Design a protein around this ligand. Structure first.
Ligand SMILES: [Mg+2]
Ligand SMILES: [Mg+2]
Ligand SMILES: [Mg+2]
Ligand SMILES: [Mg+2]
Ligand SMILES: [Mg+2]
Ligand SMILES: [Mg+2]
Ligand SMILES: [Mg+2]
Ligand SMILES: [Mg+2]
Ligand SMILES: [Mg+2]
Ligand SMILES: [Mg+2]
Lengths: 141, 185, 57, 126
RNA sequence: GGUGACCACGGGUGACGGGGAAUCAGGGUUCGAUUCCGGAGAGGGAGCCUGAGAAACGGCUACCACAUCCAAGGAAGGCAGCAGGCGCGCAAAUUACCCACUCCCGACCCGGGGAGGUAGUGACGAAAAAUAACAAUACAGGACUCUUUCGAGGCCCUGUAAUUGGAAUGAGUCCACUUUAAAUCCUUCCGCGAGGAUCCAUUGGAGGGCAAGUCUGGUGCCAGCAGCCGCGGUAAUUCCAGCUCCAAU
């Protein structure tokens, strides 16, 4: 069982210390790796240049082509696929155009279908897809 | 470095279990029952009461005849009678706990506009109070949700400077009067 | 693989419609009056096996 | 007709050579009061002429029934042009100041160090 | 000789230290570069004068590291003061006005203070709080009373409409005043300023978790949806649309 004694404040502290390098959710957060690995250098979103448009094939049970963008981030020069959300919006984005890419909500998990795509596009040439696909702000020229 | 204030803190709490139904179906009554501005305005009073009840409950853990309990208690109770919730000297604390929202609503100005005839339907009240028609004592009050001190109940009255109360008929009646003098006469 | 031609097939060919106009909807606190009133005090009729606040007849 | 200027908190400041108190102006639907009227109506009040009364502060509050503020009274204009600050004398045409305007000063006075001590060039100035 | 698994020594930090913060049944957990206290550094180090008091950077001495003018001999460079710009960047304000408040230095009541205050920018954030109310109708109803019911008296009601109707007000605009330093802003008020077609509330949703339609169009494993569960292959409660509703607002 547990150690339970009265001058055992350390055997306890030091017990509950190491038996966190067996937690998963902290070994992301406190180790290093994460900051080192995620192209998003601990940063909520990030800007990057659209280097080409790529359709991705969804995971078996749901057949469809997902319509994403290969990005290269400015700060790193680290590359990316980001699924351009909402219908017919890939149609908006052209090559070499500067996009603000944010996460998906799973923080590292790829979302649902879109096998291995953490990132979603938000803005395009200082616009925001939400404004374009609503037809509020037009494409700049 | 600068002068200035800070110490800004919220007046409310949002619910956890975000839409129960049961909770919505209570909190709506409250909005209609008394013509409330919005939903938040409940969980203002909801948050304020929960303070009191936790202040009270803080005291119920203390031993009796202990300088704090006696002092903070009276002070706290007085503060409630003062605004007209506990009555007559109910004033012994445990009782505070048995007390619900309805109360710090019933003593909002808005309610005590039609409770004292004055308005004519609950929403008049909230209009009338905003419209700078009613006064308290001498100040003209703009605010619906001013909790009325029990003392200052009898001094809620149609402002001296407003159309009903007297002086300067408002611009609508002034214009449809000047239509009869200028336009017709 | 995959043809990116089909981006925006559907918004593309769905026939658009007018959004109409009637009532500038009442808002703020009057909304909430209209709300309570229309599903608390007013109608509250003989029950017809549960409601359907946005359901059909 | 309806103004009724009632005062609060009068002090005989022997050592600033003054009388000083909170002005409490009542006023009904008619709007604020100007400081000229209030001076002349506070003059016959204590019988000191309007000349020797200085008023600032004045803050009205809802309904327009009432407006508080601070006014005060020296025993001669000679002292008032001494104990009183500039803005309150300059408030009414008795003592004004230069209009060089701050950055003209600064631009000048950061020159005149460049030049040594040849007054002619310091007088050169801007 | 001294220290050591009561963990030293070694390494790391997305570490200036406290005072606190949001979270929170009790216990913690992370954050505290954040105005208050304490420390440090003025590209980096070192050394210096001078000074009570400094190893002082709105001093200087080199060096290193930066960089300006040039008559090519030479010369002047330090925003981690305030403003501003560039670069970096997911990510942050005006070459604004002033010593009037609080305070400080001076030889000093008298100058100066980007210390500081005041404006501007400013969904960092917190408070209050409009976006309509009411009478009569037309009705649409439902507790007394009256009727076997159908009907009616009506104290009760409430739905939509006619807006029938005038009353009330602010958002604006703008005489005037206060404010302040001069404003501004606020508070005060003259004068104008509500019948929607206006003075026009949006963002997500509408299978479930989860409050809200097997309403109606279109597509038909495509487009697309879907944080998870999932839907889409010819009536989709799931896509794109229309109408209705819900949550906060
Ligand atoms: Mg590092
Ligand atoms: Mg630097
Ligand atoms: Mg130093
Ligand atoms: Mg140095
Ligand atoms: Mg400097
Ligand atoms: Mg920001
Ligand atoms: Mg400043
Ligand atoms: Mg806010
Ligand atoms: Mg509006
Ligand atoms: Mg759902």
């Amino acid at each position: 069982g547990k150690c339970r004694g009265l001058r055992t404040a350390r055997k306890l502290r030091s017990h509950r210390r190491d038996h966190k390098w067996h937690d998963k959710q902290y070994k992301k957060a406190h180790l290093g790796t994460a900051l080192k690995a995620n192209p998003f250098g601990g940063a909520s979103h990030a800007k990057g240049i659209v280097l080409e448009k790529v359709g991705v094939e969804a995971k078996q049970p749901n057949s469809a082509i997902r319509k994403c963008v290969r990005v290269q981030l400015i700060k790193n020069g680290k590359k990316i696929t980001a699924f351009v959300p909402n219908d017919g919006c890939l149609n908006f984005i052209e090559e070499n155009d500067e996009v603000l890419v944010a996460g998906f909500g799973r923080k590292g998990h790829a979302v649902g279908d879109i096998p291995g795509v953490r990132f979603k596009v938000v803005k395009v040439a200082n616009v925001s897809l939400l404004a374009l696909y609503k037809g509020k702000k037009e494409r700049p020229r | 470095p600068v002068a200035r204030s800070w110490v800004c803190r919220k007046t409310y709490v949002t619910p956890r279990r975000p839409f129960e139904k049961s909770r919505l179906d209570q909190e709506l009554k409250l909005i209609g029952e008394y013509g409330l501005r919005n939903k938040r305005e409940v969980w203002r009073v909801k948050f304020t009461l929960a303070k009191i009840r936790k202040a009270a409950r803080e005291l119920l853990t203390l031993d009796e005849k202990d300088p704090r309990r006696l002092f903070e208690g009276n002070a706290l109770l007085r503060r409630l009678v003062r605004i007209g919730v506990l009555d007559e000297g109910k004033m012994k604390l445990d009782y505070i706990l048995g007390l619900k929202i309805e109360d710090f609503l019933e003593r909002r100005l808005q309610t005590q506009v039609f409770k004292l005839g004055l308005a004519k339907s609950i929403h008049h009240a909230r209009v009338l109070i905003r419209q700078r028609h009613i006064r308290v004592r001498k100040q003209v009050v703009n605010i619906p949700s001013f909790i009325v001190r029990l003392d200052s109940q009898k001094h809620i009255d149609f402002s001296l400077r407003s159309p009903y109360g007297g002086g300067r008929p408002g611009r609508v009646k002034r214009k449809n009067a000047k239509k009869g003098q200028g336009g017709a006469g | 693989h995959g043809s990116l031609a089909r981006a925006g097939k559907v918004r593309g060919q769905t026939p658009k419609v007018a959004k109409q106009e009637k009532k500038k909807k009442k808002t703020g606190r009057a909304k909430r009056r209209m709300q309570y009133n229309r599903r608390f005090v007013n109608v509250v009729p003989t029950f017809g096996k549960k409601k359907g606040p946005n359901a059909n007849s | 007709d309806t103004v009724t200027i009632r005062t609060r908190k009068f002090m005989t400041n022997r050592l600033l050579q003054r009388k000083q108190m909170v002005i409490d102006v009542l006023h009904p639907g008619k709007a604020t009061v100007p400081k000229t009227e209030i001076r002349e109506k506070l003059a016959k009040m204590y019988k000191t002429t309007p000349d020797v009364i200085f008023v600032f502060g004045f803050r009205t509050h809802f309904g327009g029934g009432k407006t508080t503020g601070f006014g005060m009274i020296y025993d001669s204009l000679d002292y008032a042009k001494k104990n009183e600050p500039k803005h309150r004398l300059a408030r009414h045409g008795l003592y004004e100041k230069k209009k060089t305007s701050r950055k003209q000063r600064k631009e000048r006075k950061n020159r005149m160090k460049k030049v040594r001590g040849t007054a002619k060039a310091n007088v050169g100035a801007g």
